[PDB]
A paper describes a structure:
Norovirus (NoV) is a positive-sense single-stranded RNA (+RNA) virus belonging to the Caliciviridae family.
Next, we determined the complex structure of RdRp-VPg(1-73) at 3.1 Å resolution. Two helix backbones (α1 and α2) modeled for VPg were fitted to the electron density with lower B factor, which was verified by examining a simulated annealing composite omit map at the 1.2σ level. However, the electron densities for the side chains of VPg were not well defined, whereas those of RdRp were clearly interpretable. MNV VPg had a distinct helix-loop-helix conformation and bound to the palm domain of RdRp, and the binding site was relatively similar to that of EV71 RdRp but far from that of VPg at the active site of FMDV or the thumb domain of CV RdRps. The electron density for the oligo(A)8 RNA was not visible in the complex structure, despite the presence of the oligonucleotide in the crystallization solution. A face-to-face contact of the palm domains was capable of forming a dimeric structure, and the trimer interface was largely made up of the thumb and fingers domains in the hexameric complex. The crystal structure of the MNV RdRp-VPg(1-73) complex showed a more tightly packed arrangement of RdRp molecules than that of RdRp molecules themselves; a hexamer of RdRp molecules was surrounded compactly by six neighboring hexamers and this was mediated by specific binding of VPg(1-73). Further, the interactions between RdRp molecules in the RdRp-VPg(1-73) complex were distinct from that of the native; interactions between Arg329 and Gln389 and between Asp91 and Arg411 of adjacent RdRp molecules were observed in the RdRp-VPg(1-73) complex structure but absent in the native.
Numbering used by the authors:
A (entry chain B): 263 to 435, 441 to 491
B (entry chain E): 8 to 436, 439 to 492
C (entry chain C): 263 to 436, 439 to 473, 476 to 491
Write the structure that this text describes.
Amino acid sequence: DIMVRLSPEPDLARVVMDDLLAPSLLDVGDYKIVVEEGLPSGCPCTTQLNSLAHWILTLCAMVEVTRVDPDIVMQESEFSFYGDDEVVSTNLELDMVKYTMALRRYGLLPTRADKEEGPLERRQTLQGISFLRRAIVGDQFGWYGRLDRASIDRQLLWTKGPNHQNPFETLPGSQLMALLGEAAMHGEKYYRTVASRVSKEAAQSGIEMVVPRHRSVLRWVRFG
Amino acid sequence: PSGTYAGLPIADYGDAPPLSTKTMFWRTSPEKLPPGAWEPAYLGSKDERVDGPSLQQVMRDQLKPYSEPRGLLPPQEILDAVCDAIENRLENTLEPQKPWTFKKACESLDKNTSSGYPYHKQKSKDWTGSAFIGDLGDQATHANNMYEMGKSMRPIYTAALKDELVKPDKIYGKIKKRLLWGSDLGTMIRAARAFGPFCDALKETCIFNPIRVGMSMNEDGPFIFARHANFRYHMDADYTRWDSTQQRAILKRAGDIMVRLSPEPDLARVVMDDLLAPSLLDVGDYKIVVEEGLPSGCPCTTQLNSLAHWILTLCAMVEVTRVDPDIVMQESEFSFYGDDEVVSTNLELDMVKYTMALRRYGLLPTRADKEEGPLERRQTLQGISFLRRAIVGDQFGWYGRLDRASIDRQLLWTKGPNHQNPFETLPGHRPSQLMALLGEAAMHGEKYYRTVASRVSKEAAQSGIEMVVPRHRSVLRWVRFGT
Amino acid sequence: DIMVRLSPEPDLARVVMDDLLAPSLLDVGDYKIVVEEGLPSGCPCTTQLNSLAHWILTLCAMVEVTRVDPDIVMQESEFSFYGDDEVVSTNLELDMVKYTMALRRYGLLPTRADKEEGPLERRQTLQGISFLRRAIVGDQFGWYGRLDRASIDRQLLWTKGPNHQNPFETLPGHRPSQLMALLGEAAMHGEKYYRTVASRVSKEAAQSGMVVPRHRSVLRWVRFG
């Protein structure tokens, strides 16, 4: 309804949204079944819609805990929503017990990092939080998001290509420089490791590639 | 052979010898023990002090914790960052070393301990003063050739029980005897050649790095404690079952650090992979498979354990404070000797969440009052314990002082050959240990020094020769300030 | 008196100290004059003696200011004395006004770093204070004393040799250990200054007839080694 009211052609978007949010027909191959609830995550705009829903739910929980009007929360808070992914920063003293209780009451499934039962954790610093598979870090140059180490090693182990049946087939056929950049934000040690791996790899395939110094590629990815 | 021994899988049959029923501790005088005094641990079915279980049952009781579910692993980003920080600090601190020869690795071993599998022979029985010969010589040569070839060998550990003075409740009440891991000569030599350079280079910087393995309390102690006292808050977690509760992944990170700093990294990688693989412990009846815990048999096991302790502590502090590990490391001073720690820091640490993260990692920290709850944090270094010493400070500086009870114990008990009745009086020599005891007693004042001096004079005037009991001030100056 | 009473032959040392502290005969070339006061800084022990005097004076001022006993001062404080050079660390709440007043009353001439009149400055951190012409610095590895930059550049500009008249004459002689020690002292200032000093040393070695290590190796050698 928000998206329609904010659209330049509200009646046509109203019809399209009513069609989108009606009980959906999912084709599982054998039959077409009717899914009445959940999110139909197929449409191109589904990410914005999902993010707006996340925003609504979060604000609702905070108004249920603080009992103050949503504008008060929203002027005292900064939200970041990408579908199911969130980062919530706020100045209000939030009772995390009741916050988690209200979240679980809505049907949601919030989880602690230790995967144990109990209330959600709130920290006094943004460092360490994860967003878009990256960790939020800060230094004398400012804040940044750095891809975790597992994803870098993983993309060093696997490359994308045409569809095949045995995942352990080696492909006899860019991304390496992006991996080098993402590894530069982890220090000179990990950069040296990744640089050795890429140098050994690219000398077994295609063409040679310059392996920059840590400081140069770090400068390029941080301050472009 | 299949089955389950003490909750742990069975792999093969046991070639280990029977558990020792003797003790090395002798009484110094035929007088009656004071009530509540300490006595050597339970000695088996032949122990005439109590009727207790078999030593096999006590070893089973000590092996039960190794079957227990592990704790949670720290967050991966924190772990990677802290391991990189530790490795970088060691690179900045450690002096590069030259690879160890077979001769140097063979001369580094203690020849008064068992060779382990398969001979269980005292190393000195096949020692020439230069290299190994005989059975132990062939074992050593095979281990060395496999080391040079970069080929893997699986270590076979031998289980034993520790002979030591324990509180009487551990003898006349619920009987307990600490579990010891002995290693085989081949694995000893492999680990020596691999990590001798690293351990020695770490020992040369026992003052500037928290791994305090190899330090001398009387010479290097005061500096360590002044460095600690430069900081605001001080704590000691005093973990219970440190080795049983360790996770092999943390030990693998520590071993990666130890290998990356070694002069022969490819060979040390193979040796560490062999050390940290599922361990084969020989409990006498069977050879069982211990998949987790710490195999505390190898010569480098102390450095490895200390590094793991460092990793875990830093991880917990970074998980609570969310500040970078190097920032912690310049705002903190650690002292680690295996399971023993002293942590000094300026950061305002939420001891509740700190203890929560520690218990989440599988560790078992205990309060001083032995009651459950959060860890204690103090604003002074005074009272903290490290290497069985108490940290004290005065106008001359800081120092480590042996407790009074330990002094009384060493006055009551002396080490000698293995016997069956701990209350037998030793007719033999301790002319050197006694002077050290006099020095340790001097740090308690002239009264306690007079008492200890009376006891020493009485003990040496009823036996052998004698010695001149120096003035309090002279021996105090001698033990405090190097002479 | 302290130094004599602690010597193994106190009666023999007494006469020598009485001779040392008596009105001194200073030879200024034309005459031998009588210096009744001051410190005769010629004897081998003159530094220790001076330092002991420094100790006394410092302690006196503090007990005159704090009104607490000197042994309590000394167990609640840490002193460092090298003749006229000192570093005083203490936990006592010290009125720097009365401290400087008592020092100037004793004939001493304490000076601020900014060369302005007023009481002495006390800081809550040991970092930055100077002792033996070196600065006290601390890092994640511990504390250390590092020679200032000006002295390093000066020793790069000036070298010791035989006595001559024109200070701007260039010495034609071809210094190993001196330059290596200078490289070490420059290493404790960071890789930037170490690179500059290393370039200067190499350039000064291309006019004569060593291995210039990486910063980290020499840094570890001079810090821990």
